Design a binder for this molecule. Structure first.
Ligand code: TPV
Ligand code: CL
Ligand code: CL
Ligand code: NA
Lengths: 99, 99
């Protein structure tokens, strides 16, 4: 699809068999998800946003469907205003920014 | 142009007579610029992101040139770690996400 930006670019994602809403964010290096249970081990990470840094749990090789496109990659879990799909998975689904 | 997202989508902007680097951010409602002076009236605002909120100065009817395309709209100025072009100006230059 072609998504215009007059409204927030929110899509449906599926992770751990659950449907959730997430924001497509070309400004984010990483994919940040609200508190939930994921399988496997996690590693520590600090990420920066406009209001300062947060500590997150980094899970690698997680299966996630984004707007109907399959991705398998790193997701970080932490305090976030919204679920955010960042460039690490936007590249997996072939997304580009065009103008 | 067509911008892949393997790297951060940074472009040159012109604002207030100055050339700067800025991040094209489909996840940001607003355009947030690091501290600088702009002409005209402003009012205080709080904007929230990852990390929490920051206090900014809101200037309306500011013109920006973004990768050579002119746009006008509201710009907020404050202690952001990076200059961000948000949806309010991305729409004006016809930017879309495609996959
Ligand atoms: C995962 C971190 C993402 C990011 C990184 C910024 C950055 C980049 C390079 C280096 C350092 C830091 C980019 C980003 O879009 C925001 C947020 C949106 C998630 C952001 C950006 C700009 C302004 C706002 N505030 S707001 O009032 O315009 C706003 C508030 C909330 C939302 C909502 F959709 F997230 F809810 C969107 N916009 C927020 C952010 O806080 O940091
Ligand atoms: Cl505006
Ligand atoms: Cl349009
Ligand atoms: Na003004």
């Amino acid at each position: 699809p072609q998504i215009t930006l007059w409204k927030r670019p929110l899509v449906t994602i599926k992770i751990g068999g659950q449907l959730k809403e997430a924001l497509l964010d070309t400004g984010a290096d990483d994919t940040v998800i609200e508190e939930m249970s994921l399988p496997g081990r996690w590693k520590p990470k600090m990420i920066g946003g406009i209001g300062g840094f947060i500590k997150v749990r980094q899970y690698d090789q997680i299966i996630i469907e984004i707007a109907g496109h399959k991705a398998i990659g790193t997701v970080v879990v932490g305090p976030t205003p919204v679920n955010i799909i960042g460039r690490n998975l936007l590249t997996q689904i072939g997304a580009t920014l065009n103008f």
